[PDB]
Amino acid sequence: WTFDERVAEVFPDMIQRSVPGYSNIISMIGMLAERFVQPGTQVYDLGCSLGAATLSVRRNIHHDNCKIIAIDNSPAMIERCRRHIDAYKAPTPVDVIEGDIRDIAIENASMVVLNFTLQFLEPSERQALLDKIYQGLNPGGALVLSEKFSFEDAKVGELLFNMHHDFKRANGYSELEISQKRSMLENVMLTDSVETHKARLHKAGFEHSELWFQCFNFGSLVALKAEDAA
Amino acid sequence: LGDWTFDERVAEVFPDMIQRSVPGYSNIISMIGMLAERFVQPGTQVYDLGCSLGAATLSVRRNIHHDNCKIIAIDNSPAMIERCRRHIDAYKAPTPVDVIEGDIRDIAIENASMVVLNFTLQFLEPSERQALLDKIYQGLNPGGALVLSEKFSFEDAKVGELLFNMHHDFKRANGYSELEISQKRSMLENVMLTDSVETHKARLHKAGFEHSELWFQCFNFGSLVALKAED
Numbered sequence: 472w473t474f475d476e477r478v479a480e481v482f483p484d485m486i487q488r489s490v491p492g493y494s495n496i497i498s499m500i501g502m503l504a505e506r507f508v509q510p511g512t513q514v515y516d517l518g519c520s521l522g523a524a525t526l527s528v529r530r531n532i533h534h535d536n537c538k539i540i541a542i543d544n545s546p547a548m549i550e551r552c553r554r555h556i557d558a559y560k561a562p563t564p565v566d567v568i569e570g571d572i573r574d575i576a577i578e579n580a581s582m583v584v585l586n587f588t589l590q591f592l593e594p595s596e597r598q599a600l601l602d603k604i605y606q607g608l609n610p611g612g613a614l615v616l617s618e619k620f621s622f623e624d625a626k627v628g629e630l631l632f633n634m635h636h637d638f639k640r641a642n643g644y645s646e647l648e649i650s651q652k653r654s655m656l657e658n659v660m661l662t663d664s665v666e667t668h669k670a671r672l673h674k675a676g677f678e679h680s681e682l683w684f685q686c687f688n689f690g691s692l693v694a695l696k697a698e699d700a701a
Numbered sequence: 702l703g704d705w706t707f708d709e710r711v712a713e714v715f716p717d718m719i720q721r722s723v724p725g726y727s728n729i730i731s732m733i734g735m736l737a738e739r740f741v742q743p744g745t746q747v748y749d750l751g752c753s754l755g756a757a758t759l760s761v762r763r764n765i766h767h768d769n770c771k772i773i774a775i776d777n778s779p780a781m782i783e784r785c786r787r788h789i790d791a792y793k794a795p796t797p798v799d800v801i802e803g804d805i806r807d808i809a810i811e812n813a814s815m816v817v818l819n820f821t822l823q824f825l826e827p828s829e830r831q832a833l834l835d836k837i838y839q840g841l842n843p844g845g846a847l848v849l850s851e852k853f854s855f856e857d858a859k860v861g862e863l864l865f866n867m868h869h870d871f872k873r874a875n876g877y878s879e880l881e882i883s884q885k886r887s888m889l890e891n892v893m894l895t896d897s898v899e900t901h902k903a904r905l906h907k908a909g910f911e912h913s914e915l916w917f918q919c920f921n922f923g924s925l926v927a928l929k930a931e932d
């Protein structure tokens with residue numbers, strides 16, 4: 472699997488047909504941004520792809536002097552992402568950076584989004600990234616962490632695999648040329664349970680976290696840094 | 702409780718009222734249909750408990766392709782039953798529906814491949830909820846499923862507050878306050894006694910369910926699926 476030009480071309484339709492609840496989570500990210508993005512601060516869209524989460528945050532910022540930093544290590548994604556974000560006017564500028572989220576600093580951040588990105592790192596790298604995000608968020612800041620989950624209960628995992636299978640069938644996933652290769656990707660991805668995600672978030676320092684969305688085997692957590700945090 | 706009544710006024714506006722106030726509701730109705738396609742077995746019954754106008758019933762009914770099933774839709778509101786009868790009568794399908802005016806606390810659950818409590822258990826007194834779940838587990842056939850969808854409470858007050866505010870913002874975005882019923886509906890929500898996800902899971906385990914999981918959530922609303930072991 473590579474996030475190449477072909478993937479960047481079909482990405483919005485690929486993700487729509489394969490991630491149950493994706494558009495709801497994009498909407499939820501924007502709603503959160505209205506309440507959590509602070510004046511004069513930064514928001515990070517980590518593994519931004521074509522910038523869908525970036526643009527949903529950006530439409531919901533009504534403060535001056537914010538900036539969104541959208542980062543992805545796929546050159547094809549970045550090229551399309553920069554052009555795509557340039558198509559829409561807003562007062563908040565976006566820095567679209569080709570780079571690795573394992574390396575980038577998190578500074579003066581009121582919000583950070585990992586919208587189906589952490590799953591692409593090696594499992595052993597996940598904690599360091601979440602630790603870095605917690606440290607770089609300002610007090611009162613929020614992280615949104617959306618993932619495909621695994622399930623400890625194998626019978627429940629099977630049911631949710633089947634539901635995902637039926638969802639893809641209902642949405643004509645197999646019409647897409649990329650669908651076999653995407654399925655091959657998902658078959659080798661290493662996903663964590665909700666409990667595992669909550670534990671890492673706690674370990675990184677987040678004083679409050681919770682699952683705020685789920686649909687079958689996909690979902691999203693929101694984690695808040697306390698307003699009185701050190 | 703309070704001054705809330707499920708009268709003809711509420712029955713008229715119900716679909717719009719729920720759409721503007723329950724995040725995820727239509728997604729949960731679609732998921733119930735998807736589950737029915739896999740779980741509703743030939744020659745068995747499905748129960749829609751607290752059916753209101755039949756939305757969950759009809760989603761199940763459209764996803765049964767066996768010729769010898771039956772859906773039993775039960776509600777104790779005369780207004781909601783009267784409109785539910787007429788609403789279900791508007792749509793053709795092979796599976797018949799028995800629309801029964803009655804109390805879910807009293808109804809027997811027999812030969813059931815699937816039971817739905819789609820925003821209904823929250824209306825019982827907390828002390829009555831286990832008995833209903835126990836009865837549903839016992840009445841499910843092996844391999845059967847329960848869908849239990851609720852507004853949830855949250856132990857972490859900061860999280861509870863965030864999800865309250867998100868629900869507030871969702872209602873604003875969807876023009877909830879345009880509805881005449883909105884203030885009375887909010888009053889109802891303000892007196893209903895909701896449980897946490899962990900509390901629901903504990904009742905389901907205590908009833909006998911060998912497998913349960915949250916399979917949907919959106920802000921402070923969501924749904925659990927509980928499976929009875931096969932054999």
Ligand SMILES: Nc1ncnc2c1ncn2[C@@H]1O[C@H](C[S@+](CC[C@H]([NH3+])C(=O)[O-])CC(=O)[O-])[C@@H](O)[C@H]1O
Nearest residue numbers: 474518519520523524543544545571572586587591
């Ligand atoms: N180490 C890395 N560093 C930077 N980018 C990375 C890295 N590893 C993978 N990527 C990038 O992570 C993104 C994941 S897609 C995110 C969807 C988007 N957030 C959305 O809300 O539409 C979801 C998916 O493909 O399922 C891809 O664009 C990768 O190039």
Ligand SMILES: Nc1ncnc2c1ncn2[C@@H]1O[C@H](C[S@+](CC[C@H]([NH3+])C(=O)[O-])CC(=O)[O-])[C@@H](O)[C@H]1O
Nearest residue numbers: 707751752753756757776777778804805819820824
């Ligand atoms: N003891 C009871 N016995 C029978 N019915 C009852 C009882 N108590 C309350 N009800 C009925 O439970 C239903 C709850 S609505 C269900 C939505 C539907 N399932 C849907 O998927 O659209 C959700 C809402 O009003 O928030 C009402 O019609 C009550 O009359």
